[PDB]
Design a protein around this nucleic acid. Structure first.
Ligand SMILES: [Zn+2]
Ligand SMILES: [Zn+2]
Ligand SMILES: [Zn+2]
Ligand SMILES: [Zn+2]
Lengths: 196, 195, 192, 191
DNA sequence: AAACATGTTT
DNA sequence: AAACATGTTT
DNA sequence: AAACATGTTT
DNA sequence: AAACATGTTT
């Protein structure tokens, strides 16, 4: 079926967020508060804090999944274009399937999974409590294909579904935002909020 | 490396085109002197073939691509990875999804990849002009923007239309530079401009 | 002091590589010198003729080229080992210079006796059909960091070691993690 | 912190003098001062009507650019450990501004805002003079990695009272660098 | 001062 | 890339 | 950053 | 056509 994209705080109050991302000449990435939109160069890393009020179960995992924003596309899956999934660059750390779009870095436990029935690709990472003294649980993500790759996304608006799931796999919470992995997240952001 | 030296041949093998006005957005256009041709993606494209003395039996017409720049002549011309999987343009599986040049409207045409050099090309049996005409138009389709990532990266490329015999020895050869792009109009007026 | 004498080893342990406006990194054939922007990634193929033992690990260790410095160790300057940037994936000690990325098995080790820092990675055979065993490396401090390396020529010692830790092979090259590996390379080979 | 020029009731005014590789130099109009690292630096203080008892002179740094005014000014991590300049431990290794040649001077970090500053009891001019020179040392190149990254910064010399309310305030932009000569001639140039 | 080494900005 | 900012060398 | 090359959208 | 989206150059 088509994955849900309806904000769900969950029982533990599952909430994501970011932080300061000044224009910094060419910040590797930046996020817009209201637009729930994030921009960010190719393979470069990208944080993402995870708040919670009441501690989660055992399995406590955090699936990150991509999927189109536009209707007529929700039906299709999100893979890395043919080129980038062969160029070999970014494909040395073969720990990640050369087809997935989203990669978590700096976590050995993370496991890449492709739904067998729907074909949908996603990445799981065991939930580790905040850093003693903090409340956020930053996670490192890498997007492997310009949201404008020929034969891949063709500038087709796409959004990421970060969801807090349990051991068995039922949802415990879900949040969501639109991403635009590009070249100059600076321009494409100022130049974007502009238009309006 | 394949030869790119103009060779009229014994039968006076000559190619050409015709009127290609700006027509708002003509699918394609050719520049007389620049021996350069521009033309949108998959869209079709003519190409007349004149001859003075009738050719042999085999009489075929190989059309082959190859870079213009030196340091690249060594490398072959294939369709980038994307377009040779996108499946679009790959229903008429009659053509290998890797070739750049396709002839359309001719069942006899056969796609051949040299085994030894890896070079890809397309052959089409030579059919005499249309009773009353002297040209032998042939329909060509270019499958990859001459600026495809991991394919041609705007690397100047030219097409080698050659009239070969049954055994395969040359009988004539002509050549021109191509620039399959998006708005052959702009890229042409905007090109001749620069100078 | 660690050895820096090329040693093909019994299994024939050999490394290798392979201007793009601003290529994140580049290597010079003869100079056995490599240039490459800060934290950006960097490959490094590893050939072998005869399969190695079980432990089969690959220690990558930095160390100065100049004599009067060989005596001192190579750490990340004070600034970069606090700036917190590059220090989220706390999997790596904020002091090491060399990091391998895309390998969970890799373990960072600081010699207790000599203080020397290094990174180990279990040797995984080539990709069925290939012969090289690419490894991803990240250099965390401009070879010109104040109070860190002060442009002091430094070289990397990639060595193929066994389970117990005795050497099986060793190769070596000079590195210059900088800003514009392009310039600093063309502009370098120039001088001569 | 406020950066609006305030002559005050006693007519609190600062100034410099002749600065023709001078360890430092100041530009009249630009209200900008340049000056090598740890090297010393004067700063005359004029007044028309004598100040109260407390009479102190807080010297405080702070960015010029908007998006930074929010952040504090500390010595980068390196220089506040290098130990050099940190023998006369009389000064916290983190402060940027140091007054030298005055034992009474006390270094204070605001507890609530985190802002660092240095106080020095106001001593009347030298019998026959009207200025009250004060010696300042800037401990971090206004271009230190992880410290100021060439981020324009300015100093707020203010004449405060015993309780701490302001009595006057003046201000100028500083650029502690390497060759205050070049960076000055080469600066006024650009325009 | 003038030139040169190098990260950053345009 | 090209120009420029800035602290060392020379 | 600013300009430029080029496919896509309006 | 004209304006605009987007990744390279400069
Ligand atoms: Zn891609
Ligand atoms: Zn293509
Ligand atoms: Zn450093
Ligand atoms: Zn400093």
């Amino acid at each position: 079926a088509s994955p849900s994209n309806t904000d769900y705080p969950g029982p533990h109050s599952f909430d994501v967020s970011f932080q300061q991302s000044s224009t910094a000449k060419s910040a590797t990435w930046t996020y817009s508060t209201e637009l729930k939109k994030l921009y960010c160069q190719i393979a470069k890393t990208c944080p993402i804090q995870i708040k919670v009020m009441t501690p989660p179960p055992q399995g406590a995992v955090i699936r990150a999944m991509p999927v189109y924003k536009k209707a007529e596309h929700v039906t299709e899956v999100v893979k890395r274009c043919p080129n980038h999934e062969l160029s070999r660059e970014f494909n040395e750390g073969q720990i990640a399937p050369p087809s997935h779009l989203i990669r978590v870095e700096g976590n050995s436990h993370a496991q890449y999974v492709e739904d067998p029935i729907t074909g949908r690709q996603s990445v799981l990472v065991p939930y580790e409590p905040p850093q003693v003294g903090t409340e956020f649980t930053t996670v490192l993500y890498n997007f492997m294909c310009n949201s404008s790759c020929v034969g891949g996304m063709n500038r087709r608006p796409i959004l990421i579904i970060v969801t807090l799931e349990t051991r068995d796999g039922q949802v415990l919470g879900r949040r969501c935002f639109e991403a635009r992995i590009c070249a100059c997240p600076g321009r494409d952001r100022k130049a974007d909020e502009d238009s309006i």
